[PDB]
C-alpha cells in the first residue's frame, strides 16, 4: 500500500492547510506510481472556499 488505510482517522501536518492539527477521514488512496498526493481526506468542517476535502501525501499525515 501507499499510505493510511481507507476510513482511518488521520491528522494533517501540512502547515499551509486550513486543517493543520485537525482530524479527517481517509476516503481513497491511489496506488498509481507517480502520484504525489494520493491520500484523499474528508473533513467535518469546511475551509474559507467551502471545500471539505483535500489531497495529501502520506508523509504529512499521521495516525491520530
Amino acid at each position: 500500500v501507499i499510505g493510511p488505510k481507507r476510513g482511518s482517522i488521520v491528522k494533517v501536518l501540512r502547515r499551509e492547510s486550513y486543517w493543520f492539527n485537525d482530524t479527517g477521514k481517509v476516503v481513497a488512496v491511489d496506488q498509481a506510481p507517480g502520484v504525489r498526493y494520493p491520500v484523499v481526506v474528508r473533513f467535518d468542517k469546511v475551509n474559507y472556499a467551502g471545500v471539505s476535502t483535500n489531497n495529501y501525501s502520506p508523509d504529512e499525515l499521521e495516525q491520530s
Binding site: Y18, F20, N21, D22
Partner: protein, 161 residues
Amino acid sequence: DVAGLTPCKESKGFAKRQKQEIKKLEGRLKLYAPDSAPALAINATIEKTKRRFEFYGNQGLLCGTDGLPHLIVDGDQAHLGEFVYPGLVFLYIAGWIGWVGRAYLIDVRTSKKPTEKEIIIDVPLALRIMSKGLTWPVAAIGELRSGKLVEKSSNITVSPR
C-alpha cells in the same frame, strides 16, 4: 476621608441637590389640580426622590465637592457593597452563562448535525444544561484540575509561522 470625601449624610451639596430636585418637582406640580392623575404621578416622583436620597444617605456613600456619591473600588471594607459584592454577583452570573453555554456546545458536538442544534436549540437539552450552572465554579475547578478544561496545543489549528 478616603480621598477627602465627606459622607453624604452631612454633605451640604447632597442636601442642596435634594432641595433643588424637590423644588423643581413641586414647581411642575403647581400647574395641575391636586386630584388629577398627573398630580399623582408627580407626587409619586417626589416620594421616589425622597426615598432614593434617604437610601443613599443611609449606606454611608461618599460625596465629593458638591453632592455626588463617589464609589471606592480599592477593596476598602467600608465600601465592599459598591464593587466587590456586586462584582462577585456579576462574576457568578457571567460564569454561569458562559459555563452553561460551553456545556451545551460540548453536548452538541457529539450530535450527528451540530449546526442544526446551534441554529435550532434543543430546549430540553439546553434547559437541563442551564440547571447545572448553579455550582459552576466547582465544575470549572474540577475540569481545570482534571485537565478536561483546556485543549492541548497539539490539537488546535494554527497558521504558518
